[PDB]
Design an enzyme around this catalytic site. Structure first.
Site, PDB file in Angstrom:
ATOM      1  N   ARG A   1       0.825  -1.198   0.000  1.00 29.19           N
ATOM      2  CA  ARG A   1       0.000   0.000   0.000  1.00 29.19           C
ATOM      3  C   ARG A   1       0.865   1.257   0.000  1.00 29.19           C
ATOM      4  O   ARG A   1       1.605   1.519   0.957  1.00 29.19           O
ATOM      5  CB  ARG A   1      -0.915  -0.050   1.236  1.00 29.19           C
ATOM      6  CG  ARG A   1      -1.974   1.033   1.344  1.00 29.19           C
ATOM      7  CD  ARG A   1      -3.004   0.686   2.424  1.00 29.19           C
ATOM      8  NE  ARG A   1      -3.943   1.779   2.688  1.00 29.19           N
ATOM      9  CZ  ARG A   1      -3.827   2.655   3.687  1.00 29.19           C
ATOM     10  NH1 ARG A   1      -2.813   2.581   4.542  1.00 29.19           N
ATOM     11  NH2 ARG A   1      -4.717   3.634   3.815  1.00 29.19           N
TER      12      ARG A   1
ATOM     13  N   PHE B   1       1.621  10.613   1.308  1.00 31.73           N
ATOM     14  CA  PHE B   1       1.220  10.156   2.626  1.00 31.73           C
ATOM     15  C   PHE B   1       2.242   9.143   3.194  1.00 31.73           C
ATOM     16  O   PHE B   1       3.039   9.473   4.089  1.00 31.73           O
ATOM     17  CB  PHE B   1      -0.194   9.570   2.523  1.00 31.73           C
ATOM     18  CG  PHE B   1      -0.694   8.934   3.785  1.00 31.73           C
ATOM     19  CD1 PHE B   1      -0.311   9.418   5.034  1.00 31.73           C
ATOM     20  CD2 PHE B   1      -1.561   7.848   3.724  1.00 31.73           C
ATOM     21  CE1 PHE B   1      -0.791   8.822   6.196  1.00 31.73           C
ATOM     22  CE2 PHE B   1      -2.036   7.257   4.874  1.00 31.73           C
ATOM     23  CZ  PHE B   1      -1.651   7.744   6.108  1.00 31.73           C
TER      24      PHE B   1
ATOM     25  N   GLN C   1       3.426   1.570   2.940  1.00 31.44           N
ATOM     26  CA  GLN C   1       3.173   0.569   3.980  1.00 31.44           C
ATOM     27  C   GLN C   1       3.627  -0.811   3.541  1.00 31.44           C
ATOM     28  O   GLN C   1       3.386  -1.220   2.398  1.00 31.44           O
ATOM     29  CB  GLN C   1       1.678   0.523   4.323  1.00 31.44           C
ATOM     30  CG  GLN C   1       1.299  -0.519   5.393  1.00 31.44           C
ATOM     31  CD  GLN C   1      -0.180  -0.516   5.697  1.00 31.44           C
ATOM     32  OE1 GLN C   1      -0.910   0.333   5.197  1.00 31.44           O
ATOM     33  NE2 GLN C   1      -0.642  -1.478   6.497  1.00 31.44           N
TER      34      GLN C   1
ATOM     35  N   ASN D   1      -1.229  -0.688  12.669  1.00 35.03           N
ATOM     36  CA  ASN D   1      -1.912  -1.510  13.669  1.00 35.03           C
ATOM     37  C   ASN D   1      -3.380  -1.646  13.352  1.00 35.03           C
ATOM     38  O   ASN D   1      -3.832  -1.264  12.272  1.00 35.03           O
ATOM     39  CB  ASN D   1      -1.687  -0.990  15.106  1.00 35.03           C
ATOM     40  CG  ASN D   1      -2.179   0.451  15.326  1.00 35.03           C
ATOM     41  OD1 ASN D   1      -1.459   1.288  15.903  1.00 35.03           O
ATOM     42  ND2 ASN D   1      -3.403   0.730  14.920  1.00 35.03           N
TER      43      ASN D   1
ATOM     44  N   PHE E   1       5.034   1.645   8.422  1.00 33.06           N
ATOM     45  CA  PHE E   1       4.911   2.570   7.306  1.00 33.06           C
ATOM     46  C   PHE E   1       5.992   3.627   7.400  1.00 33.06           C
ATOM     47  O   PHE E   1       6.533   3.910   8.495  1.00 33.06           O
ATOM     48  CB  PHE E   1       3.512   3.198   7.184  1.00 33.06           C
ATOM     49  CG  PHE E   1       3.088   3.990   8.373  1.00 33.06           C
ATOM     50  CD1 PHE E   1       2.586   3.350   9.515  1.00 33.06           C
ATOM     51  CD2 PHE E   1       3.148   5.384   8.354  1.00 33.06           C
ATOM     52  CE1 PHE E   1       2.144   4.078  10.627  1.00 33.06           C
ATOM     53  CE2 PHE E   1       2.711   6.125   9.456  1.00 33.06           C
ATOM     54  CZ  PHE E   1       2.202   5.467  10.602  1.00 33.06           C
TER      55      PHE E   1
ATOM     56  N   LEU F   1      -1.854  10.949  13.315  1.00 29.69           N
ATOM     57  CA  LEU F   1      -1.533   9.578  13.756  1.00 29.69           C
ATOM     58  C   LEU F   1      -0.810   9.584  15.079  1.00 29.69           C
ATOM     59  O   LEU F   1      -0.579   8.523  15.650  1.00 29.69           O
ATOM     60  CB  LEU F   1      -0.693   8.830  12.708  1.00 29.69           C
ATOM     61  CG  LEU F   1      -1.340   8.707  11.327  1.00 29.69           C
ATOM     62  CD1 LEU F   1      -0.367   8.129  10.341  1.00 29.69           C
ATOM     63  CD2 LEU F   1      -2.626   7.900  11.404  1.00 29.69           C
TER      64      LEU F   1
ATOM     65  N   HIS G   1      -0.071   5.599  16.686  1.00 30.52           N
ATOM     66  CA  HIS G   1       0.938   4.746  16.061  1.00 30.52           C
ATOM     67  C   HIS G   1       2.306   5.040  16.681  1.00 30.52           C
ATOM     68  O   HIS G   1       2.682   6.210  16.871  1.00 30.52           O
ATOM     69  CB  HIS G   1       0.947   4.947  14.546  1.00 30.52           C
ATOM     70  CG  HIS G   1      -0.349   4.583  13.901  1.00 30.52           C
ATOM     71  ND1 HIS G   1      -0.549   3.384  13.251  1.00 30.52           N
ATOM     72  CD2 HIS G   1      -1.538   5.229  13.868  1.00 30.52           C
ATOM     73  CE1 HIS G   1      -1.806   3.302  12.850  1.00 30.52           C
ATOM     74  NE2 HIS G   1      -2.427   4.412  13.215  1.00 30.52           N
TER      75      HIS G   1
END
Lengths: 11, 165
Positions: free
Chosen positions: B55, B60, B63, B102, B113, B122, B126
């Site tokens: 991903r 951004f 991942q 997660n 990521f 986040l 995270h």
């Protein structure tokens, strides 16, 4: 949206 | 002592792209850093070598780390299936930050990521545990194959990985 999940990716 | 440095050799559809080295903050999040370090050397008998970035969303993050299902539904830590959020001392302050993916509180496995922008929403959700030390240009190159919905146009893989220091 912009999340970083494992399994159920959300908006 | 010194924080460990680990590396990933990235390939695009089997063509080598380059090497990204990360510094892991073992002095702030020892348990989380150790997990990533062991998964990079493959010393427990399983790890990131050969896995893919499933991903990538331009602007951004990238991942990866699902070495069991290769789709976001798998992976596991070196401590069993999942472990606790160690602490949230560090924040997602900009490009290069290494953080754990997660599925809610205390569900850390092997997925992580690499941030390509500041992602403050986040923070506190995270666990940030490292940062890109060298090769940020390789991460930027990686973004080119991603999309708004996350699907990559090429297969981005970790051709090799290990510990440098």
């Amino acid at each position: 949206x912009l999340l970083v999940t494992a399994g159920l990716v959300l908006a | 002592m010194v924080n460990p440095t680990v590396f990933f050799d990235i390939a695009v559809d089997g063509e080598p792209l380059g090497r990204v080295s990360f510094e892991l903050f073992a002095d702030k999040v020892p348990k989380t850093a150790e997990n990533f370090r062991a998964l990079s050397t493959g010393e427990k008998g399983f790890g990131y070598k050969g896995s893919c970035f499933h991903r990538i969303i331009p602007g951004f993050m990238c991942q990866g780390g699902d070495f069991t299902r290769h789709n976001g539904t798998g992976g596991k830590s070196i401590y069993g299936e999942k472990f606790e959020d160690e602490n949230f001392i560090l924040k997602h302050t900009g490009p290069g930050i290494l953080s754990m993916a997660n599925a809610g509180p205390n569900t850390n496995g092997s997925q992580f990521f690499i941030c390509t922008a500041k992602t403050e929403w986040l923070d506190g959700k995270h666990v940030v545990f490292g940062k890109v030390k060298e090769g940020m240009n390789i991460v930027e190159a990686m973004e080119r194959f991603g999309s708004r919905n996350g699907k990559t146009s090429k297969k981005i893989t970790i051709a090799d990985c290990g510990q440098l220091e």
